[PDB]
């Protein structure tokens, strides 16, 4: 009919999230951490969490390859 | 007629989930944990759950063999 | 129907927060740090946190680009 | 008799939800998140969920196209 | 029979919440933050959350338009 | 039946909190700050928080009008 | 026989719930929120929910008229 | 048969909770706040919550009348 | 069956806590404040909190009567 | 035959639950709250719930009479 | 057949929990509070909760008798 | 089947924690307090907490006996 | 035919669960609590639940005898 | 058919978790505590929880034997 | 299918965190402690925590081996 590879679809999701959409998300994540420092009180834990989340999320393909 | 081994079919499901489809799923799992840290607050429990789920899911054949 | 790019929407959020709205937020952040010194006791840590938050929040696009 | 394309009807639902009705829903979603911050306590997770839901819901056509 | 536009109804909800009812809610929000400072201890985070919630809730139409 | 304007009710809450009940609350707030200085150690931050909370809470209508 | 307007009956339910019975319910709602603060810990969210529920429930006729 | 006014029953609940039973509850609430200061550390927020809960709970009839 | 007044039970709790059990608790509270000064550093705030808690807890009946 | 009053049977259930069986249940309820404080962390809400449940359960006859 | 008093069974549970089993539990509760001070930081609240839980749990019969 | 006394098991836990395992824990507790003084700043409160925790934890049987 | 005592079968289940199979289950329960502390955050409640479950499960015969 | 001892399977799980897989888990637990100190602030409680979890998890067989 | 050893995967995580990724993390940890001294006030406790975290995190394999 009009089907496609399930592997292709999940790969499309990986492609979309790690494309320009992910770059815009990364910008908003840095915006959020900036505001949290701004109208709250600065902390090393919060910047570590946000930056670490960005590193983990964009490294998902390579982190998955290392996990095999 | 046109039948096949039920054991072969269940083995095909094991083959498919642990093939490229599982690798793409593993990438999306790391994407999800990255975003959860990103727009939430980082926690060791959540990364342990996601990474442990990936380890369990790809180790299913070997974990099953150990269970005999 | 009436949809649009998800990437465009997240880019619109980046545009809005870093536009005149962010400038007004930056003013209020400097207001808050001024009052904290004013009716409290001055400290280098608090001004560093507020100013650093402003630098991080407006530098989000460029900080994200450096993170790639 | 008086039938029509099932594809047209489902496309009409996509058109209606993403039209002015969706814009009004988007306004009420931002109203709800504003009140939740207002009479509760502000959190980055809740604004991320509401804004992300709006992005996902209006991006449904394009997200579906990427999924093919 | 006696129906009406669903878009009109959702627009009526937007009109009602952002009308005099929202102004009275905004007053009570400032009352709540005043009492929290009053019988608790003052903090910049709590006033930022309450004021930000008011800004978000009344800006819902314009924030939604920017999200398109 | 026996309903009334929701706007009237929220306005009644604004009227009640800012009436004689608020004046009595304001007295107790000054009592609390006096005792905190009394059996603790005097500080400018605590009096600023309590007095600022009273100013914010009674100025809620006018602060809300300025926020429009 | 001995029938009546279904519209009258539903209007009677609206009349009864919004009459003295609703006033007594409103008193018990304020009793419940008082006890929750009393033998628990005070929170702005819980008073907002209870008071908002009272406002919504007595404003049902007018809220319904606005929805048309 | 042996029925009675539902309004009377809800009024009976209001009468019972605000009678001698409520006075005994008020005593236990002051006992609880005293012990919390006693074997913990004193705070203005906790006494405000307990005392405010007592004021709200006994003022339920009058608070409800003001809400109309 | 074998029931009793709920008011009597709550009054029994008031009687028990304010009886010899409360006197023994008062002794342990003074023990705790003595040790805190002993193996820590003396402060007027801590003795005020403990002594104030004892005064509040034993004065609960009379404090409740004043609140009416 | 060998029937009896349904009212007598329901009254027998009221008699049994409020007799020595209820006293033993009351002891176990205080045991449960003691252990919850013991191997958990003490809270005023939990003791209020357990003690309030005992007061409500033994006051059922009198609470029902007040409800008429 | 082989039944027994439900009151006896609930009394047996009261007997068992308050017997040597409860004494051993009391020892472990003091062990837990000792370790919490040991590998954490000492606090009066935690010892009050654990000791109070032991007092409440072993006093359940007498506390229940006072509640009648 | 293969059961045993619940009292014996809880007594076994008391035996194990207060045996050589507790002695090794006591050594590590003194190690921790030594390092806290070492790479921090010495304080009488911290040594009192750690030593008091050891005294409480090993005295659990005798402290429980005194509580009866 | 080939039947047996229903009492024997239920006793066989009691024998099997409390035999070597229960010992292996007890080991896995301690494994689970160790990992929960390990990749989460330690808490006294969770160890109390797991250890208490083991005590209850192996004490089932004796706990049942006490219940008669 | 192709069955095996349920006791053997649960023993296999005990063998697997306490084998090389557990050693690798122990390494990751020490990694996690190191990072928590690293990008957060050092605390004795967190290292006690992680190390205690490792001790409990690998001691599960012997801890279970002591519980009998 | 496409599975692998769960032990290998957990060992891969140990390999990845302790490889070049850990070296880069170690650099950022020293960066963070430098900035904390820089825009705050120097303290021996904070450098001890950060350096100790690095020592613990890279020593995880050897610390785990010592724990056996
Ligand atoms: C593309 C870069 C994205 C990061 C933006 C960096 C730019 C720029 C980052 C730094 C820009 C601001 C510099 C001044 C900030 C400051 O000094 O603020 C004073 C506040 C005072 O607050 P308070 O009174 O409450 O006391 C809290 C403290 O106890 C006492 O000080 O102290 C702090 O908060 C701690 C300092 C945090 C430093 C974070 C650096 C992170 C860099 C890098 C971190 C690397 C994260 C690694 C993540 C893991 C990756 C696997
Ligand atoms: C051949 C082995 C098959 C099993 C695979 C084991 C491999 C490997 C199993 C473990 C591999 C992952 C280790 C890290 C997992 C983790 O730490 O995740 C954090 C999440 C955080 O989530 P959240 O925020 O929602 O809070 C939920 C909790 O309250 C707070 O933590 O915590 C948990 O979920 C609890 C931990 C469950 C541990 C299960 C071990 C089962 C082993 C053995 C179980 C034996 C089962 C016995 C069955 C009965 C037999 C008769
Ligand atoms: C074509 C793409 C279609 C998917 C749309 C993705 C676009 C875009 C997807 C992401 C766009 C929104 C980003 C921000 C969302 C957010 O951060 O919200 C905060 C809320 C806060 O709520 P709360 O307080 O209740 O706490 C709940 C949590 O415990 C604490 O956070 O946290 C969450 O809900 C968890 C985050 C879910 C992330 C889902 C990503 C799925 C992507 C991909 C998933 C792949 C699915 C694979 C399916 C299987 C396939 C075989
Ligand atoms: C229509 C205006 C509505 C706001 C009312 C402003 C009027 C008036 C606002 C200010 C009126 C009071 C001035 C004095 C308050 C004070 O100095 O209190 C001392 C307390 C002492 O407490 P403690 O001992 O616990 O130590 C806590 C601190 O660490 C040490 O000080 O310090 C503080 O709390 C921090 C100061 C907060 C300042 C908030 C200003 C917000 C303005 C504007 C904020 C803009 C919010 C933007 C939201 C986002 C929008 C997108
Ligand atoms: C007829 C009026 C009915 C309401 C009764 C008002 C009377 C009277 C209402 C106020 C009477 C009590 C005043 C003192 C209460 C107090 O200060 O308590 C300290 C506790 C401390 O607890 P903790 O340690 O856990 O920390 C929790 C906080 O983070 C730190 O403080 O702080 C609070 O709980 C927050 C304060 C809530 C204020 C609610 C006002 C609602 C009014 C009006 C609300 C308007 C609701 C609008 C609903 C929506 C309508 C569309
Ligand atoms: C004619 C208007 C009819 C609606 C009545 C609105 C009037 C008035 C509506 C608002 C009047 C009450 C305002 C204060 C309510 C409040 O703040 O309560 C605190 C409780 C605290 O509870 P808790 O502790 O359990 O934590 C739960 C939350 O996680 C933490 O907060 O928080 C909430 O519940 C979330 C807030 C819900 C806001 C709903 C607004 C809906 C409006 C509009 C919705 C639009 C619906 C669109 C439907 C789809 C249409 C296609
Ligand atoms: C019938 C009266 C019932 C109240 C009992 C009053 C009797 C008597 C009330 C007062 C009797 C005790 C007086 C001395 C208490 C004391 O000084 O303790 C020192 C502790 C030290 O602790 P720490 O080291 O942790 O530092 C915490 C602080 O930051 C530093 O000090 O400081 C405090 O806790 C703050 C002081 C709270 C004062 C509360 C008064 C409430 C009155 C009235 C409140 C009105 C409540 C209004 C509710 C809303 C109504 C709508
Ligand atoms: C026959 C009497 C039955 C009750 C047993 C009373 C005996 C005796 C009752 C008291 C015996 C113990 C006294 C010391 C307990 C303690 O101080 O513990 C410290 C813990 C510390 O924990 P954490 O660190 O987590 O911080 C939690 C708090 O925020 C900070 O403290 O603080 C608490 O838990 C709050 C104190 C609760 C007090 C409950 C009294 C109830 C009495 C009476 C209640 C009346 C109930 C009315 C019910 C409704 C009736 C209609
Ligand atoms: C003849 C009277 C019959 C009623 C018995 C009242 C006697 C007496 C009723 C009250 C006697 C007990 C007083 C103390 C109870 C308590 O404070 O418990 C703490 C628990 C803690 O639990 P947790 O940790 O899980 O957190 C759950 C909450 O989120 C945090 O607190 O909090 C609660 O449960 C909420 C309080 C419920 C109050 C119900 C009052 C109903 C009265 C009246 C209700 C009117 C009902 C109207 C029905 C509709 C009629 C049309
Ligand atoms: C059979 C007895 C069982 C109890 C064991 C007592 C033996 C022995 C109990 C005492 C043995 C140790 C004595 C030295 C402890 C110490 O001084 O530690 C310093 C730490 C420093 O920590 P940090 O820096 O974090 O600052 C925290 C403080 O703010 C500053 O100090 O200060 C404390 O923690 C407060 C002191 C608590 C005292 C508790 C006594 C309870 C007795 C009796 C309590 C009675 C409980 C009543 C319960 C309710 C009953 C209804
Ligand atoms: C022959 C005796 C049979 C019973 C075995 C008792 C032996 C022994 C029974 C007790 C043995 C274990 C003691 C320690 C258990 C524990 O403390 O666990 C911590 C968990 C933590 O879990 P979490 O994080 O999810 O938070 C859940 C809670 O909110 C926070 O704590 O807390 C609990 O679960 C509540 C405690 C339940 C206590 C049940 C006692 C029942 C006795 C007697 C009950 C009587 C029953 C009456 C029935 C009605 C009769 C008419
Ligand atoms: C194979 C060994 C695994 C452990 C690694 C040990 C190696 C190495 C462990 C030690 C390596 C680092 C040494 C310097 C650390 C330091 O001094 O940091 C300063 C920070 C400053 O932070 P802040 O400003 O926030 O103030 C927090 C404090 O209040 C003030 O200081 O102080 C601390 O955090 C307390 C010190 C914790 C010491 C933990 C030792 C655990 C050992 C052994 C613990 C035994 C655990 C037993 C578990 C139970 C077993 C049944």
Curated annotation (Swiss-Prot), chains A, B, C, D, E, F, G, H, I, J, K, L, M, N, O:
It is a multi-pass membrane protein. Its main location: membrane. The keyword Transmembrane applies. Keywords: Cell outer membrane, Crown gall tumor, Membrane, Plasmid, Signal, Transmembrane, Transmembrane helix. Interacts with host plant RTNLB1 protein. Belongs to the virB2 family. This is Protein virB2. It comes from Agrobacterium fabrum (strain C58 / ATCC 33970). The lineage of its organism: Bacteria, Pseudomonadati, Pseudomonadota, Alphaproteobacteria, Hyphomicrobiales.
